């Protein structure tokens, strides 16, 4: 795991250096989206679990 | 101590109330929604202290001898505590606030004239004569 | 200003009013003189109550 | 009633399409839109503006038999 | 496995949460018990760094960071770079990485786009060794190596920035261009006046050693002045 | 002092700047002191002086 | 005279009884100022380093409003058409960051641009496009739904329907960023308890009556905002 | 169900056990127990009282504290003699309804109301044909609430 | 408006980077900049 | 489900939720009440059905 | 507008309505206004004296002030926007609508034959120096003091 | 259903008219119910807009016995057939 | 409507969909199916998300 | 439990309505839909109050194990009838569903249209079978008959593709409804067929209108034309649309109109001939001339904002409309 | 409402029972009139307060035609 | 009174037991929950006060400014003359050379006043106005200059008295501005002759903005107790009737 804008990239063009840059970004970028959406679905996946249960009883309950 | 009564239905007081099984349970359902909406009315002072003590000294006594009406044995006991409603229903009324605190500042060297209290007031008062007369005369017929 | 509600404090004065309002005639002539009438003035304001008595 | 042959300059005060409020727009084909004609805009919201102009005048109107 | 272990973290904040909730009201709680006015006491809430949920910021101790500074969200900070007082550095949106020895003028905003089309990212990308000034607004940009921002400038979301490149203050990188490198641009729309010079160089290079030395000493004189954290 | 704890120190606390006006009066006091019987006769003294008739037409006839 | 260590910056701060006033779900950053008879919409999201002086006049804020950190805002007290010189902003403006507001108007449906300038007068109407790093000539009217730049600003182009509704939706798109946001801070300060007890708090000089008290009744309000004074 | 031993310190405790949810009885209807005097005066009722009513009124007293404290916080702005006085009375009132539950306890227990230590010679016998209830409280703390189910 | 992820990763988008070149050099005192993204 | 006490608890964790919810506060604030608020229901419930 | 390019900002002051209005005190009051706006908008924003204003405009959907007026326009909601308009300006106004006539008519102050509703006039490039006078308009229940 | 039990044509009748005539009044002010954005009706307390959370409690149950109450009527119904069993006994 | 190309299948399209105004935001382009049916954002299959310059940041400053 | 939840319906319309709809005109149209519903539900409510009250029980065995009496039984039919055609809609009391269908949003006109007349029309069915009635259906099968006489005749006038196909709707709703008029006799199949076919119909009407509205912007003919020449697509499916909704032999509605002209010619010969010369002509032409002028033409205005084909999900809701109107004929006969 | 209008339905239902026949008429004549004539009056409102005092009057006028047919 | 007895008692042994029991509790759970809510989460921290940094020799004289806003940032070597006025949110960094403010001398907010050398002497003149938002760079300003909020003052910009920068105008580099000269424009060039009512406008307004900062610092100079009062104030201001405010 390297951090190309912590990388000493003074040895190419500076378009070749951008592009490299560029490239890094959308990996990290990314990574961070799929990290953030692994975190977001257990906002639903936790509520789900948690009061489903309790929900069907009520429901039950007050129906038959 | 509505709940820890008991006792045989009768009546009360030289035949003037009326002791049931019925009018208990009226006046513990009145009780009940009395307490609610004051329990609401309580919670809506806490925001805005709009309303005086004046107000709340008014509802306490209505709330007070509201309930009794339930027990009335007799069209001329009935017809008193009705007459109590209204004057506590009146006297609540005349404890609604003239001025409240506003922002127009637009109106400080001119006079606004509003008529509505009054108007809430005599129409009030004249109703509650008229019904107060009917209702007199009508006892006065049945008890002949 | 302190305890004049809308009122703000100016350079040449201080206002009678809230900010953007209107100046009333007859607060300024009270406020100016005190009790000085030099003649019962016909404004527009006087010449309405006399038509409306 | 018929339309009148007689040329007439663009509506000034018709009425005209509006959108309820806070309207998500419809962006389909790239939201692109032109400005309507006003005698099209006119002629679309004419029969639901359309009244009567005095009363038990809809009988005689048109043909009286049909 | 990776939805498992991101509910239980889930689960753990909530927990915390409410465990801090509760402690907090029974504190003040307290306090109205024995008469005390400690707990409404109107302390400012600020905070230096903000982690933004599951956006921890992440920067080496080589850097200073005055406290007015206000970096929030998803920050990756290189070593020995300064940011200067009140800048902000909002992560929310998207990742923000800056390279090492790197300056920030005071009262710098550095913020993303919420979204762009594919072949430019919305992460704001910063080299190293770069210098920009006070009141500088840089916005979903990719800048590289040791660029010349003046005073006021601002970059538009898209910006590319070549290295060895020189913006005047009070100056717009527009949105979605490409600065060359080597050349000095000018106005608010930003045109190329000509190209940079060694001297200019050079003298850009030792203003960002300066400025470098001079976040050191600031932080030296905030630690002892108990003004900086740590 | 102030026991720190972490970074609260657990022991802080302001004195509160609001309280009673009539806090240290002496009809405060507890009721059949010395302080209280003296405030309780004043106040007697002063009741009976503004209101003779009303005081003496409610306690004498009770 | 000015030496301490705690600062004492409350971004809520009323001058003679004008309290500013705020909407609900409101997000004021803490290192934002807000002095002087301020009227904040509901949903109104303030950035960090921003002022918003309402002493010489009042200051309306709408309920979509986006404003931009290090946004001056203040008024002029007096305009030179004698028209209101108070700001007023519409429904939903979305200020750019590093502003300039000088006792303007802004209608609804207004993206100011970055490090922008609007001095006394100047009235943008509705949907009005105002680019970054531009001075607004005081007392000029901005067409409606108008593409304008410059220093002073000229009339660039028209704006379009897509535009508009464009930027309609990116004014929409900071609400998950600010309730973000207003879910990072608790509730309750935590700064209170990290001080440590000093000579006046501990031995009060002077004592004052007991009235109603600032927090009175308020276990029955819901916490909405965490930031709460 | 048991009723708790009367002339103790939890007799109040019996009227809150009730074998059926009606107000008041019919006008012929025999009472629950043996009748001590249906002609009470005034005098007999106070007469009457005992150590059930000493702890009816003990627990209004009790009870009474917190009741006031829940009424004096919802004063503001009020001098502390005046809050102490409020209080107080609060307290009086709380001390005077549980005096006026334990008079209305004793005039019970003489009518034979509530148990007083007294059982009738012949039992009334009731089927009870619709009974949704026994189950339901068998199996509950509504059982202790309800006399003889 | 479209809020879903452009730049996707679930694969590589195909593009030529020889239609639109940027100009890097010569620019006129007035000119405008050159377009960073020229991808096709 | 068959229980008045767990239909009280439920009916009160919902009520608890959609009182949060609706006063646009965010949810985890004034946990004690939860449970409160769930075991005073239940008491509710269960009195209501002896009832 | 029809405005080019490169061509500068025009100043408010050349789209100045002006409205010389009578206010309750017998003053003559100089009010300024924008076009399109509505009167009641411009006394708003103005803080012009003696307008209640209860209804606050009124209806918000298919209002009076859209034109032409839709056949299912609900009208004015109060009697309070009544401000008397000057001969030129009235006659231009032209007649007032069905709903307008039969709220103004319902109205406790006595009303005038130059009377229309603030929230009902709209601001038109030909109401330039117009003529108005505001009597005090009613107050109507117990919150329009509040 | 009580008045078809009682056979009251002319009753139902009547009251089917009027209760056609207040949902007509009632749904008259939902057509004013749209605003062209969010209002400000809440009292402001401590600079900020100040919710009940008493009320805002109380609000939901009340909306929770509206809006699904009707299938717990069979309780309410029951309760109050007891209260009236001893009216006339 | 003979320049026209949605896809830019006869033409070449740019990835920026669009040449940046010099005053104007650089948003996306409105698309010419406006379906808002799309399903969640897909990673491909295994891919590593864990922040690894912050990780190594870490590593550093620890 | 039927009336009930019949009844149930009416708050998600009316919430649909208020929130989802675009057009500013919609507020009064949502009003006057939820009106004529709650005129209808109340008369149905009434009925069925009687019904219940009649006979303490809650089975349709137990119902016809009762008989009710002349007036009973006449007042039932009625006020079934009456609530049944505010909901169907039958003539005079359909400006609410011609002011609905004119301004409300096309996904829930789509739904209003082809699942609540199709519920009320089962309600009525099933209410009306239990109940055995001696009474002369005369009343109802005019009523039926006019209604769609005068749904017909309108189509000439409309010029708004979505009020054209409202009435096309009204009148297909007034002819299926004219079916069960003869009690329990065997005219349910052909309504239930006359239903479904009426429903992917006009499904597949509301989706060409709301296709158009995205394309052009409109929904009247005056400012859109030569769709066609500019959308190929489109004008093939309109085509194709029109060619189905004329009853072409092969589609469910050729057997459908068969099986209902036989019982009506079968009852009434003449009154079967007129039915079938006013909609299948008159209504028919108006209808093609309405959207033939639309799909021919040359779209010479707004060439800088010309309108893109059909996506892929259009067309392969069309394509399974078509399928389904198609592949719906070749069911067992067993139920039909 | 709570007193006043369950006080009146006793009094026709509980009270005065005996004298039912003669309430009938008058009472149907009452509930004849109020329709005819507030229906006019209820579609003419401007103010909440009065929307909410004609809620109340519908309902009691409800309530009367309600106790006239549980009299029977 | 047995029941005033037991008011007391219980109120006595409620605070002074419960208090120190309960903050106790109250503090350990708050402890524990700012622990496991660790690392996704954020705690309150001690602000430090910007307006007192002192750099090794430099420390900001101020004293005698009339106005010190509670979150300006004032480090290093600047001198401050009496009435002198930094408005929020300004930043004067006197570690890249010495500052001498003038009196009457007022600083907008938001104004960053940082020289372009790493040693220079920004001097402002007496009455001198500074714009909100501005950028000065290391500049000479003369007695009763105004510079408009937005400005842009380079590094070699002299000023002369009574010279007008207009709002958003930036200065270029070694600029001399006259006398009763008026420039505006992103290019500064001398727009105007300043007519006697634009000096006399020019001159209410640094005498308000004067009064303002005044105002202010009264207000911004308010101790915790100061603060709780003003606030108790508002609140039984919300409900104190008309007959109450004619009684105060
Ligand atoms: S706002 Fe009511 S009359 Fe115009």
């Not at chain 14, 709707?169 to 239930?192: K, P, R, V």
């Not at chain 15, 004298?19 to 009472?27: A, C, P, Q, S």
């Amino acid at each position: 795991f390297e951090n190309v804008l912590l990388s000493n990239r003074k040895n190419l063009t500076p378009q070749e250096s951008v592009q490299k840059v560029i490239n890094y970004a959308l990996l990290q970028d990314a990574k961070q989206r799929s990290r953030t959406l692994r975190h977001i679905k257990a906002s639903w996946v936790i509520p789900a679990l948690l009061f489903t249960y309790p929900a069907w009883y009520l429901a039950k309950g007050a129906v038959n | 101590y509505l709940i820890t009564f008991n006792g045989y239905s009768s009546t009360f007081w030289w035949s003037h109330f009326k002791l049931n099984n019925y009018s208990l349970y009226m006046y513990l359902l009145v009780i009940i929604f009395n307490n609610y909406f004051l329990y609401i009315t309580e919670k809506h002072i806490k925001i805005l202290n709009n309303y005086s003590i004046d107000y709340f000294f008014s509802i306490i006594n209505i709330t007070l001898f509201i309930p009794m009406i339930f027990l009335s044995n007799t069209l001329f006991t009935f017809f008193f505590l009705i007459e109590l409603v209204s004057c506590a229903i009146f006297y609540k009324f005349i404890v609604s606030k003239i001025s409240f605190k506003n922002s127009n500042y637009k109106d400080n060297y001119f006079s606004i004239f509003s008529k509505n209290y009054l108007n809430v007031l005599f129409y009030q008062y004249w109703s509650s004569f008229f019904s107060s007369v009917m209702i007199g005369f009508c006892i006065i017929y049945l008890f002949s | 200003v302190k305890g004049k509600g809308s009122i703000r404090k100016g350079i040449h004065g201080e206002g009678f009013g809230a900010p953007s309002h209107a100046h009333d005639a007859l607060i300024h002539q009270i406020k100016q003189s005190k009790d000085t009438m030099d003649y019962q003035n016909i404004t527009n304001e006087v010449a309405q109550n006399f038509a409306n008595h | 009633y018929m339309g009148n042959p007689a040329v007439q300059s663009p509506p000034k005060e018709f009425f005209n399409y509006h959108y309820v409020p806070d309207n998500y727009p419809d962006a389909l084909s790239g939201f692109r839109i032109a400005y309507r004609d006003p005698f099209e805009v006119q002629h679309v919201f004419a029969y639901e503006n359309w009244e009567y102009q005095y009363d038990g005048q809809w009988w005689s109107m048109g043909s009286l038999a049909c | 496995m990776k939805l498992f272990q991101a509910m239980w973290t889930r689960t753990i904040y909530s927990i915390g949460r409410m465990v801090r909730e509760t402690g907090l009201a029974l504190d003040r709680y307290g306090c109205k018990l024995e008469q005390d006015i400690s707990c409404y006491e109107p302390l400012s809430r600020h905070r230096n760094i903000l982690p933004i949920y599951d956006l921890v910021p992440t920067f080496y101790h080589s850097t200073f960071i005055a406290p007015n500074s206000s970096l929030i969200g998803a920050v990756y900070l290189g070593q020995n770079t300064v940011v200067g007082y009140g800048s902000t550095l909002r992560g929310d949106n998207h990742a923000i990485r800056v390279g090492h020895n790197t300056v920030i003028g005071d009262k710098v905003a550095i913020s993303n786009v919420a979204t762009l089309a594919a072949g430019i990212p919305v992460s704001t990308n910063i080299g190293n060794h770069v210098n920009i000034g006070a009141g500088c607004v840089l916005q979903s940009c990719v800048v590289d190596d040791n660029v010349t921002v003046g005073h006021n400038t601002v970059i538009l979301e898209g910006s590319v920035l070549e290295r060895g490149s020189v913006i005047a203050p009070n100056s717009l990188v527009p949105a979605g261009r490409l600065i060359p490198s080597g050349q000095l641009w000018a106005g608010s729309p930003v045109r190329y006046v000509r190209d940079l010079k060694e001297e200019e160089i050079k003298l850009n290079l030792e203003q960002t050693e300066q400025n470098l030395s001079i976040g050191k000493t600031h932080k030296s004189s905030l630690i002892q002045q108990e003004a900086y954290d740590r | 002092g102030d026991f720190f704890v972490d970074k609260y120190n657990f022991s802080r606390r302001v004195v509160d700047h609001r309280q009673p006006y009539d806090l240290n009066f002496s009809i405060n006091n507890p009721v059949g002191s010395r302080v209280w019987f003296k405030a309780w006769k004043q106040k007697a003294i002063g009741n009976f002086l503004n209101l003779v008739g009303v005081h003496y037409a409610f306690y004498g006839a009770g | 005279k000015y030496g301490e260590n705690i600062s004492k910056h409350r971004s809520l701060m009323s001058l003679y009884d004008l309290h500013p006033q705020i909407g609900y779900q409101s997000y004021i950053a803490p290192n934002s100022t807000v002095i002087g008879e301020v009227t904040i919409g509901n949903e109104t999201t303030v950035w960090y380093n921003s002022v918003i002086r309402g002493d010489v006049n009042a200051v309306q804020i709408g309920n979509n409003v986006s404003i931009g950190e290090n946004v001056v805002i203040h008024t002029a007290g007096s305009l030179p058409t004698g028209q209101p010189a108070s700001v007023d902003i519409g429904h939903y403006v979305i200020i750019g960051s590093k502003s300039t507001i000088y006792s303007c108007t802004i209608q609804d449906e207004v993206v100011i641009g970055q490090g922008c300038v609007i001095l006394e007068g100047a009235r943008i109407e509705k949907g009005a496009m105002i680019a970054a790093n531009s001075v607004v000539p005081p007392g000029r009217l901005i067409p409606a739904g108008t593409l304008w730049a410059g220093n002073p600003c000229t009339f660039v182009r028209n704006l379009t329907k897509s535009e508009l509704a464009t930027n309609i939706d990116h004014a929409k798109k900071q609400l998950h960023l600010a309730q973000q946001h207003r879910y990072e801070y608790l509730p309750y300060n935590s700064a209170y308890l990290q001080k440590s007890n000093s000579e006046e708090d501990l031995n009060p000089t002077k004592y004052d009556d007991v009235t109603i008290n600032y927090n009175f009744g308020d276990e029955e309000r819901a916490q909405e905002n965490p930031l709460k004074y | 169900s048991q009723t708790f031993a009367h002339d103790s310190f939890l007799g109040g405790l019996n009227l809150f056990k009730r074998r059926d949810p009606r107000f008041v009885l019919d006008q012929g209807e025999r009472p629950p127990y043996p009748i001590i005097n249906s002609n009470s005066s005034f005098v007999d009722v106070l007469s009457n009282f005992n150590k059930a009513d000493f702890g009816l009124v003990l627990f209004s007293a009790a009870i009474g504290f917190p009741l006031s404290r829940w009424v004096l916080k919802g004063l503001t702005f009020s001098s502390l003699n005046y809050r102490r006085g409020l209080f107080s009375s609060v307290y009086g009132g709380v001390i005077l309804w549980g005096l006026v539950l334990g008079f209305n306890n004793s005039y019970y227990r003489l009518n034979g109301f509530v148990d007083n230590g007294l059982v009738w010679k012949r039992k009334e016998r009731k089927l009870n044909k619709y009974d949704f209830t026994s189950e339901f409280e068998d199996n509950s703390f509504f059982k202790k609430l309800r006399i003889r189910d | 408006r479209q809020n879903f992820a452009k730049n996707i990763t679930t694969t590589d988008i195909p593009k030529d980077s020889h239609h639109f070149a940027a100009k890097r050099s010569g620019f006129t005192q007035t000119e405008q900049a050159p377009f960073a993204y020229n991808d096709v | 489900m068959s229980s008045m006490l767990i239909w009280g608890a439920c009916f009160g964790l919902f009520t608890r939720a959609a009182a949060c919810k609706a006063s646009m506060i965010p949810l985890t604030t004034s946990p004690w009440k939860y449970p409160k608020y769930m075991i005073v229901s239940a008491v509710t419930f269960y009195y209501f059905d002896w009832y | 507008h029809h405005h080019h390019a490169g061509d500068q900002a025009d100043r408010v002051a050349d789209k100045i309505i002006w409205i010389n209005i009578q206010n309750r005190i017998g003053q003559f009051e100089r009010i300024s206004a924008f076009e399109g706006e509505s009167l009641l908008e411009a006394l708003q924003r103005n803080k012009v004296a003696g307008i209640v204003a209860t209804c606050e405009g009124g209806e918000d959907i298919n209002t009076m002030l859209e034109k032409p007026i839709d056949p299912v326009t609900y009208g004015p909601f109060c009697s309070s926007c009544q401000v008397v308009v000057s001969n030129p300006w009235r006659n231009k106004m032209g007649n007032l609508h069905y709903l307008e006539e039969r709220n103004l008519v319902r109205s406790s102050y006595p009303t005038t034959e130059n009377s229309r509703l603030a929230c009902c006039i709209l601001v038109e490039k030909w109401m330039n120096e117009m003529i108005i006078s505001i009597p005090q308009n009613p107050n109507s229940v117990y919150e329009d003091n509040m | 259903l009580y008045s078809s039990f009682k056979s009251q044509y002319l009753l139902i009748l009547f009251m089917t008219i009027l209760n056609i005539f207040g949902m007509y009044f009632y749904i008259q002010n939902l057509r004013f119910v749209v605003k062209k954005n969010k209002s400000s009706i809440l009292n402001y307390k401590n600079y900020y807009v100040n919710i009940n959370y008493s009320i805002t409690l109380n609000i939901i149950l009340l909306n929770f016995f509206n809006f699904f109450g009707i299938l717990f009527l069979s309780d309410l119904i029951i309760i109050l057939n007891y209260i009236s069993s001893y009216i006339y006994i | 409507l003979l320049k026209f190309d949605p896809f830019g299948f006869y033409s070449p399209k740019l990835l920026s969909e669009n040449r940046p105004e010099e005053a104007m935001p650089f948003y996306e382009d409105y698309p010419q199916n406006d379906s808002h049916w799309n399903l969640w954002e897909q990673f491909p299959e295994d891919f590593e998300d864990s922040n690894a310059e912050r990780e190594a940041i870490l590593k550093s400053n620890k | 439990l039927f009336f009930m939840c019949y009844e149930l319906l009416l708050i998600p319309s009316f919430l649909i309505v208020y929130f989802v709809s675009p057009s500013r005109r919609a507020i009064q149209a949502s009003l006057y839909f939820v009106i004529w519903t709650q005129l209808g539900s109340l008369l149905v409510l009434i009925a069925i109050s009687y019904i219940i009250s009649i006979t303490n029980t809650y089975e349709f065995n137990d119902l016809k194990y009762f008989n009710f009496t002349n007036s009973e039984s006449t007042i039932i039919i009625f006020l079934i009838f009456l609530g049944f055609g505010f909901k169907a809609p039958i003539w005079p009391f359909h400006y609410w569903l011609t002011k609905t269908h004119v301004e409300a949003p096309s996904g829930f006109s789509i739904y209003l249209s082809g699942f609540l007349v199709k519920t009320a029309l089962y309600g009525f069915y099933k209410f009306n079978t239990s109940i055995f009635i001696d009474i002369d259906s005369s009343i109802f099968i005019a009523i039926c008959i006019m209604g769609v006489v005068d749904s017909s005749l309108k189509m000439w006038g409309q010029t708004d593709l979505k009020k054209l196909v409202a009435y096309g709707t009204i009148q297909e709703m007034n002819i299926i409804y004219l079916a069960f008029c003869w009690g329990d006799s065997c005219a349910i199949l052909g309504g239930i067929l006359f239903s479904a076919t009426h429903a992917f119909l006009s499904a597949l009407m509301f989706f060409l209108v709301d296709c158009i509205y995205r394309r052009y912007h409109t929904r009247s003919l005056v400012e859109v034309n030569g769709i066609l020449h500019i959308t190929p697509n489109l004008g093939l499916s309109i085509l194709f649309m029109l060619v189905f909704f004329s009853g072409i032999p092969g589609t469910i509605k050729f057997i459908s109109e068969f099986y209902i002209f036989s019982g009506l010619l079968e009852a009434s010969p003449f009154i079967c001939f007129i039915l079938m010369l006013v909609a299948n002509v008159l209504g028919l032409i108006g209808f093609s001339k309405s959207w033939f002028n639309a799909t021919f033409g040359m779209p010479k205005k707004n060439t800088k904002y010309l309108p893109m084909d059909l996506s892929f999900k259009e067309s392969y809701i069309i394509l399974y409309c078509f399928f389904f109107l198609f592949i719906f004929s070749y069911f067992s006969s067993i139920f039909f | 409402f709570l007193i006043f209008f369950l006080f009146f339905s006793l009094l026709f239902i509980y009270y005065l029972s005996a004298l039912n026949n003669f309430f009938w008429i008058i009472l149907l004549i009452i509930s004849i009139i109020g329709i005819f004539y507030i229906i006019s009056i209820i579609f003419d409102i401007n103010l909440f307060k009065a929307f909410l005092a004609y809620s109340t009057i519908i309902n009691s006028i409800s309530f009367i035609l309600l106790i006239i047919a549980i009299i029977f | 009174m047995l029941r005033l007895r037991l008011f007391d008692a219980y109120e006595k042994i409620s605070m002074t037991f419960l208090g120190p029991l309960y903050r106790r509790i109250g503090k350990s759970l708050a402890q524990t929950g700012l622990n496991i809510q660790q690392p996704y989460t954020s705690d309150d921290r001690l602000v430090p006060s910007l307006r007192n940094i002192r750099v090794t020799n430099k420390i900001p004289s101020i004293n005698d400014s009339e106005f010190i806003a509670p979150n300006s940032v004032v480090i290093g070597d600047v001198i401050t003359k009496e009435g002198s006025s930094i408005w929020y949110g300004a930043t004067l960094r006197g570690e890249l050379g010495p500052i001498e403010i003038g009196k009457q001398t007022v600083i907008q907010d938001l104004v960053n006043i940082q020289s372009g050398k790493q040693n220079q002497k920004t001097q402002i003149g007496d009455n001198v106005f500074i714009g909100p938002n501005s950028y000065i760079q290391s500049s000479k300003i003369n007695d009763n200059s105004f510079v408009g909020m937005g400005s842009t003052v380079s590094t070699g910009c002299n000023l002369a008295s009574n010279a007008v920068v207009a709002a958003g105008s930036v200065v270029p580099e070694n600029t001399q501005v006259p006398s009763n000269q008026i420039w505006a424009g992103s290019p500064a060039q001398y727009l105007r002759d300043i007519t006697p009512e634009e000096r006399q406008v020019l001159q209410e307004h640094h005498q308000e903005c004067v009064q303002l900062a005044r105002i202010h610092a009264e207000e911004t100079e308010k101790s915790f107790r100061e603060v709780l009062n003003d606030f108790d104030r508002i609140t039984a201001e919300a409900e104190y009737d008309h007959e109450s405010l004619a009684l105060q």
